[PDB]
Design a protein around this motif. Structure first.
Motif, PDB file in Angstrom:
ATOM      1  N   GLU A 118      -0.468  22.979  84.105  1.00  0.00           N
ATOM      2  CA  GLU A 118      -0.552  23.363  82.705  1.00  0.00           C
ATOM      3  C   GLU A 118      -0.162  24.808  82.606  1.00  0.00           C
ATOM      4  O   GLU A 118      -0.861  25.674  83.133  1.00  0.00           O
ATOM      5  CB  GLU A 118      -1.977  23.206  82.210  1.00  0.00           C
ATOM      6  CG  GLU A 118      -2.485  21.787  82.315  1.00  0.00           C
ATOM      7  CD  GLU A 118      -3.905  21.642  81.844  1.00  0.00           C
ATOM      8  OE1 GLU A 118      -4.688  22.615  81.952  1.00  0.00           O
ATOM      9  OE2 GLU A 118      -4.230  20.551  81.356  1.00  0.00           O
ATOM     10  N   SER A 119       0.940  25.080  81.924  1.00  0.00           N
ATOM     11  CA  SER A 119       1.421  26.446  81.805  1.00  0.00           C
ATOM     12  C   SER A 119       0.859  27.182  80.592  1.00  0.00           C
ATOM     13  O   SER A 119       0.511  26.580  79.575  1.00  0.00           O
ATOM     14  CB  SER A 119       2.948  26.462  81.736  1.00  0.00           C
ATOM     15  OG  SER A 119       3.418  25.709  80.634  1.00  0.00           O
ATOM     16  N   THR A 120       0.756  28.498  80.746  1.00  0.00           N
ATOM     17  CA  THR A 120       0.402  29.389  79.670  1.00  0.00           C
ATOM     18  C   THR A 120       1.716  29.539  78.921  1.00  0.00           C
ATOM     19  O   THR A 120       2.773  29.600  79.554  1.00  0.00           O
ATOM     20  CB  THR A 120      -0.007  30.782  80.193  1.00  0.00           C
ATOM     21  OG1 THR A 120      -1.105  30.655  81.105  1.00  0.00           O
ATOM     22  CG2 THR A 120      -0.399  31.709  79.043  1.00  0.00           C
ATOM     23  N   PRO A 121       1.677  29.591  77.581  1.00  0.00           N
ATOM     24  CA  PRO A 121       2.947  29.773  76.876  1.00  0.00           C
ATOM     25  C   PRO A 121       3.666  31.064  77.291  1.00  0.00           C
ATOM     26  O   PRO A 121       3.021  32.086  77.520  1.00  0.00           O
ATOM     27  CB  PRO A 121       2.529  29.849  75.407  1.00  0.00           C
ATOM     28  CG  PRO A 121       1.218  29.154  75.333  1.00  0.00           C
ATOM     29  CD  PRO A 121       0.551  29.364  76.657  1.00  0.00           C
ATOM     30  N   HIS A 122       4.988  31.003  77.412  1.00  0.00           N
ATOM     31  CA  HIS A 122       5.778  32.182  77.757  1.00  0.00           C
ATOM     32  C   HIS A 122       5.891  33.063  76.508  1.00  0.00           C
ATOM     33  O   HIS A 122       5.361  32.723  75.448  1.00  0.00           O
ATOM     34  CB  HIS A 122       7.161  31.764  78.278  1.00  0.00           C
ATOM     35  CG  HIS A 122       7.108  30.883  79.486  1.00  0.00           C
ATOM     36  ND1 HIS A 122       7.374  31.339  80.758  1.00  0.00           N
ATOM     37  CD2 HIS A 122       6.787  29.575  79.615  1.00  0.00           C
ATOM     38  CE1 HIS A 122       7.238  30.343  81.619  1.00  0.00           C
ATOM     39  NE2 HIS A 122       6.883  29.261  80.950  1.00  0.00           N
ATOM     40  N   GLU A 123       6.584  34.193  76.635  1.00  0.00           N
ATOM     41  CA  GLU A 123       6.777  35.128  75.518  1.00  0.00           C
ATOM     42  C   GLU A 123       7.463  34.439  74.331  1.00  0.00           C
ATOM     43  O   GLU A 123       8.190  33.454  74.511  1.00  0.00           O
ATOM     44  CB  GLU A 123       7.637  36.309  75.978  1.00  0.00           C
ATOM     45  CG  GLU A 123       7.070  37.092  77.159  1.00  0.00           C
ATOM     46  CD  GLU A 123       8.101  37.994  77.814  1.00  0.00           C
ATOM     47  OE1 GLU A 123       7.935  38.290  79.015  1.00  0.00           O
ATOM     48  OE2 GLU A 123       9.090  38.380  77.147  1.00  0.00           O
ATOM     49  N   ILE A 166      13.317  30.165  75.628  1.00  0.00           N
ATOM     50  CA  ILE A 166      13.838  28.803  75.640  1.00  0.00           C
ATOM     51  C   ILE A 166      13.832  28.294  77.077  1.00  0.00           C
ATOM     52  O   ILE A 166      14.309  28.983  77.988  1.00  0.00           O
ATOM     53  CB  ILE A 166      15.271  28.730  75.072  1.00  0.00           C
ATOM     54  CG1 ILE A 166      15.301  29.208  73.620  1.00  0.00           C
ATOM     55  CG2 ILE A 166      15.826  27.312  75.183  1.00  0.00           C
ATOM     56  CD1 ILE A 166      14.388  28.427  72.689  1.00  0.00           C
ATOM     57  N   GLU A 167      13.300  27.087  77.260  1.00  0.00           N
ATOM     58  CA  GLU A 167      13.226  26.449  78.563  1.00  0.00           C
ATOM     59  C   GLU A 167      13.978  25.158  78.606  1.00  0.00           C
ATOM     60  O   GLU A 167      14.038  24.432  77.610  1.00  0.00           O
ATOM     61  CB  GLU A 167      11.790  26.117  78.948  1.00  0.00           C
ATOM     62  CG  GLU A 167      10.925  27.327  79.154  1.00  0.00           C
ATOM     63  CD  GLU A 167       9.556  26.982  79.732  1.00  0.00           C
ATOM     64  OE1 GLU A 167       9.465  26.153  80.669  1.00  0.00           O
ATOM     65  OE2 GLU A 167       8.570  27.569  79.244  1.00  0.00           O
ATOM     66  N   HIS A 168      14.542  24.878  79.776  1.00  0.00           N
ATOM     67  CA  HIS A 168      15.223  23.628  80.029  1.00  0.00           C
ATOM     68  C   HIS A 168      14.589  23.069  81.292  1.00  0.00           C
ATOM     69  O   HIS A 168      14.254  23.824  82.201  1.00  0.00           O
ATOM     70  CB  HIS A 168      16.731  23.811  80.329  1.00  0.00           C
ATOM     71  CG  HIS A 168      17.548  24.331  79.190  1.00  0.00           C
ATOM     72  ND1 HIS A 168      17.583  25.665  78.841  1.00  0.00           N
ATOM     73  CD2 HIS A 168      18.433  23.705  78.375  1.00  0.00           C
ATOM     74  CE1 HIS A 168      18.446  25.832  77.850  1.00  0.00           C
ATOM     75  NE2 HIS A 168      18.977  24.661  77.552  1.00  0.00           N
ATOM     76  N   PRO A 202       2.393  25.702  74.224  1.00  0.00           N
ATOM     77  CA  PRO A 202       1.758  25.186  75.423  1.00  0.00           C
ATOM     78  C   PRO A 202       2.487  23.910  75.910  1.00  0.00           C
ATOM     79  O   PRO A 202       2.992  23.125  75.100  1.00  0.00           O
ATOM     80  CB  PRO A 202       0.335  24.848  74.954  1.00  0.00           C
ATOM     81  CG  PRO A 202       0.089  25.746  73.801  1.00  0.00           C
ATOM     82  CD  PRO A 202       1.424  25.961  73.144  1.00  0.00           C
ATOM     83  N   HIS A 203       2.596  23.738  77.218  1.00  0.00           N
ATOM     84  CA  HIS A 203       3.205  22.522  77.746  1.00  0.00           C
ATOM     85  C   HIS A 203       2.681  22.243  79.142  1.00  0.00           C
ATOM     86  O   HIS A 203       2.061  23.107  79.771  1.00  0.00           O
ATOM     87  CB  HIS A 203       4.744  22.588  77.707  1.00  0.00           C
ATOM     88  CG  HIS A 203       5.319  23.762  78.420  1.00  0.00           C
ATOM     89  ND1 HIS A 203       5.256  25.041  77.913  1.00  0.00           N
ATOM     90  CD2 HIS A 203       5.987  23.852  79.594  1.00  0.00           C
ATOM     91  CE1 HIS A 203       5.847  25.870  78.754  1.00  0.00           C
ATOM     92  NE2 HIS A 203       6.311  25.171  79.774  1.00  0.00           N
ATOM     93  N   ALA A 204       2.932  21.038  79.633  1.00  0.00           N
ATOM     94  CA  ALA A 204       2.432  20.661  80.936  1.00  0.00           C
ATOM     95  C   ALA A 204       3.359  19.702  81.653  1.00  0.00           C
ATOM     96  O   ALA A 204       4.179  19.013  81.030  1.00  0.00           O
ATOM     97  CB  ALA A 204       1.041  20.063  80.806  1.00  0.00           C
ATOM     98  N   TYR A 205       3.221  19.705  82.977  1.00  0.00           N
ATOM     99  CA  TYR A 205       4.004  18.880  83.886  1.00  0.00           C
ATOM    100  C   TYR A 205       3.028  18.057  84.695  1.00  0.00           C
ATOM    101  O   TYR A 205       1.986  18.579  85.123  1.00  0.00           O
ATOM    102  CB  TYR A 205       4.802  19.754  84.864  1.00  0.00           C
ATOM    103  CG  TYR A 205       5.571  20.894  84.210  1.00  0.00           C
ATOM    104  CD1 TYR A 205       4.971  22.138  84.004  1.00  0.00           C
ATOM    105  CD2 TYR A 205       6.879  20.727  83.802  1.00  0.00           C
ATOM    106  CE1 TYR A 205       5.670  23.180  83.404  1.00  0.00           C
ATOM    107  CE2 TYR A 205       7.585  21.764  83.202  1.00  0.00           C
ATOM    108  CZ  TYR A 205       6.986  22.985  83.020  1.00  0.00           C
ATOM    109  OH  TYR A 205       7.687  24.013  82.416  1.00  0.00           O
ATOM    110  N   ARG A 206       3.361  16.788  84.925  1.00  0.00           N
ATOM    111  CA  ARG A 206       2.483  15.910  85.675  1.00  0.00           C
ATOM    112  C   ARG A 206       3.293  14.873  86.429  1.00  0.00           C
ATOM    113  O   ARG A 206       4.347  14.475  85.968  1.00  0.00           O
ATOM    114  CB  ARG A 206       1.492  15.229  84.716  1.00  0.00           C
ATOM    115  CG  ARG A 206       0.408  14.365  85.360  1.00  0.00           C
ATOM    116  CD  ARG A 206      -0.577  13.837  84.316  1.00  0.00           C
ATOM    117  NE  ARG A 206       0.047  12.885  83.386  1.00  0.00           N
ATOM    118  CZ  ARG A 206      -0.547  12.346  82.326  1.00  0.00           C
ATOM    119  NH1 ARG A 206      -1.811  12.652  82.006  1.00  0.00           N
ATOM    120  NH2 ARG A 206       0.122  11.481  81.572  1.00  0.00           N
TER     121      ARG A 206
HETATM  122 MN   LIG Z   1       7.237  26.421  81.710  1.00  0.00          MN
END
Ligand SMILES: [Mn+2]
Lengths: 95, 95
Positions: free
Chosen positions: B31-36, B40-42, B74-78
């Motif tokens: 679970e990531s903390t939101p970036h600045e 933009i993420e890919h 906020p976003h997450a990877y699983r």
């Molecule tokens: Mn991220």
């Protein structure tokens, strides 16, 4: 087919950025087409082995290895292995 | 361990861009903390199957597939598969 190119994302107007996924067949050679002055290119190998000709010299790149270079200078991509090589080509156009 | 992160290229000061390779073990959750703001993420899956939580919703991504999204959310990877999942993450910062 010697070279199959697929955009991973459509052209990104905000980032002035292209991201291509390329599969190069065994023995295939592809010479770059001209780019606008100032374009930066990144090549990252995903699977297989890629040969890159940059600044007139060949080097071999393995999976997750990459190189950042001036996309507006002549360069080439070559597959000298016996299986397809899958790599990504990222292009940042100048603003 | 559960998550292995590796920069594909060092921080790019001129392009304001980071590029990472990540391997998530089966059952891992990050679970990531939101970036600045304005980031933009890919994400692109290399092998395996990745679940991502964007806007409070889960979705499963497969090889050659990717997604572009706002990094300041906020976003997450699983990984809910039985195999590790290998993916690339690109991060573009506002200029
Ligand atoms: Mn991220």
């Amino acid at each position: 087919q010697a070279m199959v190119v697929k955009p991973l994302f459509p052209w990104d107007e905000t980032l002035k950025f292209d991201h291509f996924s390329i599969i190069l067949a065994p023995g295939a050679l592809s010479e770059s087409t001209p780019h606008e002055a100032g374009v930066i290119e990144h090549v990252v190998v995903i699977s297989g082995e890629l040969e890159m000709k940059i600044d007139g010299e060949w080097r071999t790149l393995y999976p997750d290895q990459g190189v950042r270079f001036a996309g507006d200078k002549p360069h080439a991509y070559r597959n000298s292995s016996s299986r397809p090589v899958h790599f990504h080509s990222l292009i940042h156009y100048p603003r």
